[PDB]
Write an enzyme that holds these catalytic residues in place. Structure first.
Site, short mmCIF file in Angstrom:
data_model
loop_
_atom_site.label_atom_id
_atom_site.label_comp_id
_atom_site.label_asym_id
_atom_site.label_seq_id
_atom_site.Cartn_x
_atom_site.Cartn_y
_atom_site.Cartn_z
N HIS A 52 0.77 -28.29 -24.08
CA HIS A 52 1.58 -27.03 -24.17
C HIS A 52 1.06 -25.80 -23.75
O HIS A 52 -0.38 -25.58 -24.28
CB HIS A 52 2.14 -26.91 -25.69
CG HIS A 52 2.96 -25.79 -26.00
ND1 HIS A 52 4.21 -25.72 -26.46
CD2 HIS A 52 2.78 -24.49 -25.53
CE1 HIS A 52 4.77 -24.55 -26.32
NE2 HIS A 52 3.74 -23.81 -25.96
N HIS A 64 3.45 -33.95 -23.89
CA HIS A 64 3.11 -32.76 -23.07
C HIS A 64 1.88 -31.83 -23.54
O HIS A 64 1.76 -31.83 -24.81
CB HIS A 64 4.47 -31.85 -23.31
CG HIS A 64 4.50 -30.30 -22.90
ND1 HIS A 64 4.03 -30.01 -21.74
CD2 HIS A 64 4.74 -29.02 -23.54
CE1 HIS A 64 4.01 -28.55 -21.48
NE2 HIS A 64 4.61 -28.03 -22.72
N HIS A 71 13.39 -24.02 -22.62
CA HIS A 71 14.15 -24.52 -23.93
C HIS A 71 13.68 -23.88 -25.23
O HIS A 71 12.68 -23.37 -25.23
CB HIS A 71 13.97 -25.75 -23.96
CG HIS A 71 12.77 -26.67 -24.27
ND1 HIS A 71 12.03 -26.66 -25.47
CD2 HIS A 71 11.74 -26.90 -23.59
CE1 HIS A 71 10.93 -26.89 -25.63
NE2 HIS A 71 10.40 -27.20 -24.53
N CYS A 72 14.59 -24.10 -26.07
CA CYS A 72 14.10 -23.67 -27.40
C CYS A 72 13.18 -24.77 -28.05
O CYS A 72 13.53 -25.76 -28.04
CB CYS A 72 15.56 -23.57 -28.43
SG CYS A 72 15.24 -22.79 -30.23
N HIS A 73 12.03 -24.11 -28.77
CA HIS A 73 11.12 -24.99 -29.15
C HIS A 73 11.37 -25.22 -30.66
O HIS A 73 10.60 -26.15 -31.16
CB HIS A 73 9.68 -24.41 -29.17
CG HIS A 73 8.64 -25.41 -28.85
ND1 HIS A 73 8.47 -26.32 -29.52
CD2 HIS A 73 7.68 -25.48 -27.71
CE1 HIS A 73 7.41 -27.28 -29.12
NE2 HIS A 73 7.16 -26.47 -28.00
N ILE A 74 12.80 -25.09 -31.21
CA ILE A 74 13.17 -26.04 -32.40
C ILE A 74 13.67 -27.15 -31.93
O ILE A 74 14.59 -27.28 -31.00
CB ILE A 74 14.25 -25.11 -32.93
CG1 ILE A 74 13.74 -23.89 -33.47
CG2 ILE A 74 14.94 -25.86 -34.07
CD1 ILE A 74 14.76 -22.79 -34.02
N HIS A 127 15.77 -18.38 -32.50
CA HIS A 127 15.37 -19.29 -31.43
C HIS A 127 14.01 -18.95 -30.68
O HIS A 127 14.19 -17.93 -29.93
CB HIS A 127 16.64 -19.74 -30.66
CG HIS A 127 17.80 -20.10 -31.31
ND1 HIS A 127 17.99 -21.38 -31.69
CD2 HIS A 127 18.67 -19.28 -31.36
CE1 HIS A 127 19.09 -21.28 -32.18
NE2 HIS A 127 19.78 -20.05 -31.87
N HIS A 172 10.75 -21.36 -24.88
CA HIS A 172 9.25 -21.66 -24.21
C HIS A 172 9.70 -22.16 -22.85
O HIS A 172 10.68 -22.71 -22.50
CB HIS A 172 8.96 -22.85 -24.84
CG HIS A 172 7.59 -23.45 -24.29
ND1 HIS A 172 6.41 -22.64 -24.09
CD2 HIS A 172 7.35 -24.56 -24.02
CE1 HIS A 172 5.68 -23.40 -23.48
NE2 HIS A 172 6.00 -24.67 -23.22
N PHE A 205 19.70 -27.37 -25.91
CA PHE A 205 19.42 -26.14 -25.68
C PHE A 205 18.35 -26.09 -24.70
O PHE A 205 17.15 -25.51 -25.06
CB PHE A 205 19.10 -25.38 -27.20
CG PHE A 205 19.15 -23.87 -27.38
CD1 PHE A 205 20.22 -23.40 -26.50
CD2 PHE A 205 19.11 -23.31 -28.20
CE1 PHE A 205 20.63 -22.15 -26.57
CE2 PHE A 205 19.36 -21.91 -28.59
CZ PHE A 205 20.05 -21.22 -27.43
N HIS A 258 7.78 -23.72 -19.70
CA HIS A 258 6.83 -24.62 -19.00
C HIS A 258 6.31 -23.99 -17.56
O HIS A 258 7.00 -23.39 -17.20
CB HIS A 258 7.37 -26.03 -18.89
CG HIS A 258 7.55 -26.78 -20.06
ND1 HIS A 258 6.97 -27.99 -20.33
CD2 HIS A 258 8.49 -26.61 -21.12
CE1 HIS A 258 7.46 -28.62 -21.49
NE2 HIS A 258 8.01 -27.78 -21.92
N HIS A 310 7.12 -35.33 -25.86
CA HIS A 310 8.12 -34.56 -25.29
C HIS A 310 8.95 -35.70 -25.01
O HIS A 310 9.82 -35.43 -23.78
CB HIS A 310 7.65 -33.64 -24.21
CG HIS A 310 8.22 -32.45 -23.96
ND1 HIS A 310 9.69 -32.52 -23.90
CD2 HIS A 310 7.79 -31.10 -24.08
CE1 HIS A 310 9.94 -31.37 -23.62
NE2 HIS A 310 9.03 -30.38 -23.75
N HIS A 366 2.11 -32.57 -27.97
CA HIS A 366 2.81 -33.04 -28.78
C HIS A 366 3.76 -34.06 -27.91
O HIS A 366 4.02 -33.87 -26.74
CB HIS A 366 3.68 -32.24 -29.42
CG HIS A 366 4.39 -31.22 -28.38
ND1 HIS A 366 5.65 -31.11 -27.92
CD2 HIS A 366 4.31 -29.75 -28.07
CE1 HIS A 366 6.01 -30.19 -26.99
NE2 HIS A 366 5.22 -29.19 -27.29
N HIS A 394 17.13 -28.63 -31.58
CA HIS A 394 18.00 -27.74 -30.67
C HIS A 394 17.92 -28.09 -29.34
O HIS A 394 18.74 -28.24 -28.45
CB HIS A 394 17.96 -26.37 -30.84
CG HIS A 394 18.00 -25.64 -32.23
ND1 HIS A 394 17.75 -24.36 -32.71
CD2 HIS A 394 18.40 -26.23 -33.43
CE1 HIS A 394 18.12 -24.34 -33.61
NE2 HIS A 394 18.59 -25.27 -34.26
CU LIG Z 1 16.93 -23.00 -31.32
CU LIG Z 2 5.40 -27.25 -26.83
CU LIG Z 3 5.01 -26.16 -23.07
#
Ligand SMILES: [Cu+2]
Ligand SMILES: [Cu+2]
Ligand SMILES: [Cu+2]
Ligand SMILES: *[C@@H]1O[C@H](CO)[C@@H](O[C@@H]2O[C@H](CO)[C@@H](O)[C@H](O)[C@H]2NC(C)=O)[C@H](O)[C@H]1NC(C)=O
Ligand SMILES: *[C@@H]1O[C@H](CO)[C@@H](O)[C@H](O)[C@H]1NC(C)=O
Length: 495
Positions: A66, A64, A448-451, A393, A396, A459, A398, A111, A109, A454
Site C-alpha cells: 500500500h 498489495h 476505492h473506499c478503504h473500508i 468513507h 484510496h 465501492f 492506487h 487484496h 495487506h 464497502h
Molecule cells: Cu466506505
Molecule cells: Cu491499502
Molecule cells: Cu493501495
C-alpha cells in the site's frame, strides 16, 4: 523485520489476540504480519508463498503493497482481477519491484475479497538514509511502529449484514469489552529525555481511530509517505490505511501512560482498558497506567498539514482547472455501493491482462461501467462528494499520491500548498473532497473506499491510465503470466 529480499509464507493459524480464539490468514504466522523494511532505492523481492488450507477464508491470496507507485510494475500491485489473478495454494509468486523515489511509512495487506480482515496485514517501512527529519528524533526502529487494527470474532465471509469490529488491537494486542480482562496489552517502551519517531499505521478494515497518549503530544512529520512540515498536535484521527510519523518527546515523569485509540464504531471509550495500550518509561512499575485523558486542544486537522518540500498543485487554481475532471457520484442502491451508478464486481480476466492481451478500446474493458480510461500525461481532478451511507468513507487511489485541494470539513479549496497523500476521508453531507494528480504511470489502478466491506460491496472504480502505453510500460514476468492459468484450473472448493 524482514526484507528487502525475503520469502513471506501465508498460513492459517488459530489465534486469540483478545482472548477469543478463531481461525485466521496470516503473513509469517503472526498478527500483524512481519514488519517489512528496506531503504529508499531498494529492489524489493518479496516471494509470497501461499500455504493456505482453509477454504472458509479462501485458499488463494494476493498482496498489495500500500502506497507504492509500482511504476513499470503494475502487475505487482496486488488487487485481484485488476492487476493479477490470485496466487493459488501450494504455489509461490515473486513481487519484484523498486522504490526509487519513495521513503516513509507504508503497509501491506491481502487484496483478494475481504481476506485482509481475516488477518493478512502488516507494516512496511522504507528508511531514507538522508531523511531531512532525522535530527528531530533519537529512536526510529521496529519498536516505534504502532499498528491500529480492527478485529472481528466472526470470519469475514461469515459476516451477516453490517460488519462491526469487536476489538481494537494495538500492535496486535487488545482487550474486548466482553472478554478476559487479563488479556495482554501492548507496551511501547521509551526512556525519559529521548525522542521517538512513532510510525502510526492504520491497518483497519473499517473504523477510524482517534489516537492520543495521555499527557503527551506530537509533531507530525510524515503523512502517507510524504514528508510534512512539523505540525504540533495532541490527538490524531486516522482513517483506514492512513499513516503518520508522529515524533514523541518522552518529556513527562517516569511512569505508565495510556495509549488510546478510540474507534468510531463498535464499543467506544476505555472502560476496563479496551481500545488501549501502554506507554512505559524505563524505570516505571510493570503495571497499567492510572493517567487521565485531558482535552485535545490541538487535534490534527488535514488542512493544517503542509508538504515539507514544495509540491505544486497540478492545473490552475479554480474548480475544474485541469485537463480531465471526473465529479464522481458516490451512491448506494440495490444492496451495493456505486460510483457513477456502477457497483464494481471483479472480472474473470484481470483488467491488466485484458489490456496486455490486446483490449485497448475503452468500451471493451470489463467490468462494463466500472473502468474509466485516463489519458497519459494529463492533470486530473476528482471530486468525491459525500452523503452516501456507511461513512465517513476513506478513499484510496492506487499507483499515485494526490493533492488534497479540498478536505472534509473544508469549504474553500487550497491550490497553493495542500498536503499530498494516498488515503483521504471524504466526510459526510455537505463535503466535496477534491483531489488532483498527474497521469505519469501507465496501467490500471484501483480507486476505492478503504473500508474493505464497502469495496467488497462494489465501492470501487478502475482507472485504466494510459491504456496504449500500458504494455510498453509493464513487461510481465513468467510467474505472473501463468497465474490465471493456475487459478482457473482450481476446483471451486480450493479457491
Ligand atoms: Cu466506505
Ligand atoms: Cu491499502
Ligand atoms: Cu493501495
Ligand atoms: C463538487 O464540486 C464540483 C466542482 O469542483 C462540482 O461540479 C460542478 O457542478 C456544477 C453543477 O452540476 C456544474 O455546473 C459544474 O460544471 C461543475 N464544475 C466542474 C468544475 O466540473 C460538483 O457539483 C460538487 N458536488 C456537490 C455535491 O456539491
Ligand atoms: C488506443 O489506441 C487505439 C488505436 O488508435 C484506439 O482505438 C483506442 O481508442 C485507444 N485507447 C484509449 C483508451 O485511448
Amino acid at each position: 523485520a524482514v526484507g528487502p529480499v525475503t520469502d513471506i509464507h501465508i498460513v492459517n493459524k488459530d489465534i486469540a489476540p483478545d482472548g477469543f480464539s478463531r481461525p485466521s490468514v496470516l503473513a509469517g504466522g503472526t498478527f500483524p504480519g512481519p514488519l517489512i523494511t528496506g531503504q529508499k532505492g531498494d529492489n524489493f523481492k518479496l516471494n509470497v508463498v501461499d500455504d493456505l488450507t482453509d477454504a472458509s477464508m479462501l485458499k488463494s491470496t494476493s498482496i498489495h503493497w500500500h502506497g507504492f507507485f509500482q511504476k513499470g510494475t503494475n502487475w505487482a500491485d496486488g488487487p485481484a482481477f485488476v492487476n493479477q489473478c490470485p496466487i493459488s495454494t501450494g504455489n509461490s509468486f515473486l513481487y519484484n519491484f523498486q522504490v526509487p523515489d519513495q521513503a516513509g511509512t507504508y503497509w501491506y495487506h491481502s487484496h483478494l475479497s475481504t481476506q485482509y480482515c481475516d488477518g493478512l496485514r502488516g507494516a512496511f517501512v522504507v528508511y531514507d538514509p538522508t531523511d531531512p527529519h532525522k535530527a528531530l528524533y533519537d529512536v526510529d526502529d521496529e519498536s516505534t511502529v504502532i499498528t491500529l487494527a480492527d478485529w472481528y470474532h466472526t470470519l469475514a465471509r461469515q459476516i451477516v449484514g453490517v460488519a462491526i469490529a469487536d476489538t481494537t488491537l494495538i500492535n496486535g494486542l487488545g482487550r474486548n469489552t466482553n472478554g478476559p480482562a487479563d488479556a495482554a496489552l501492548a507496551v511501547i517502551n521509551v526512556e525519559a529525555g529521548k525522542r521517538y519517531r512513532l510510525r502510526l499505521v492504520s491497518i483497519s478494515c473499517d473504523p477510524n481511530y482517534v489516537f492520543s497518549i495521555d499527557n503527551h503530544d506530537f509533531n507530525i512529520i510524515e503523512v502517507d509517505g510524504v514528508n510534512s512540515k512539523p505540525l504540533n498536535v495532541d490527538s490524531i484521527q486516522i482513517f483506514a490505511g492512513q499513516r503518520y510519523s508522529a515524533v514523541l518527546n518522552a518529556n513527562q515523569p517516569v511512569g505508565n501512560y495510556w495509549v488510546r485509540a478510540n474507534p468510531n464504531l463498535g464499543t467506544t471509550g476505555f472502560t476496563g482498558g479496551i481500545n488501549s495500550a501502554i506507554l512505559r518509561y524505563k524505570g516505571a512499575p510493570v503495571a497499567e497506567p492510572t493517567t487521565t485523558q485531558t482535552t485535545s486542544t490541538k487535534p490534527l486537522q488535514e488542512p493544517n498539514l503542509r508538504p515539507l518540500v514544495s509540491m505544486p498543485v497540478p492545473g490552475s487554481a479554480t474548480p475544474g482547472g485541469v485537463d480531465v475532471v471526473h465529479n464522481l457520484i458516490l451512491g448506494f442502491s440495490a444492496g451495493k455501493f456505486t460510483i457513477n451508478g456502477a457497483a464494481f464486481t471483479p472480472p474473470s480476466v484481470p483488467v491488466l491482462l485484458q489490456i496486455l492481451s490486446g483490449t485497448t478500446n475503452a468500451q471493451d474493458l470489463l467490468p462494463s461501467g466500472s473502468v474509466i480510461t485516463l489519458p497519459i500525461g494529463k492533470t486530473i481532478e476528482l471530486t468525491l462528494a459525500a452523503g452516501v451511507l456507511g461513512g465517513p468513507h476513506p478513499f484510496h487511489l492506487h499507483g499515485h499520491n494526490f493533492h488534497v485541494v479540498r478536505s472534509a470539513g473544508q469549504t474553500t479549496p487550497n491550490y497553493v500548498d495542500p498536503i499530498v497523500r494516498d488515503v483521504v476521508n471524504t466526510g459526510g453531507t455537505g463535503d466535496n473532497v477534491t483531489i488532483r494528480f498527474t497521469t505519469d504511470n501507465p496501467g490500471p489502478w484501483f480507486l476505492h473506499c478503504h473500508i474493505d466491506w464497502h469495496l467488497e460491496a462494489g465501492f470501487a472504480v478502475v482507472f485504466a491510465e494510459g491504456v496504449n502505453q500500458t504494455n510498453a510500460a509493464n513487461p510481465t514476468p513468467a510467474d505472473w503470466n501463468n497465474l490465471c492459468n493456475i487459478y482457473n484450473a482450481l476446483a471451486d472448493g480450493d479457491k
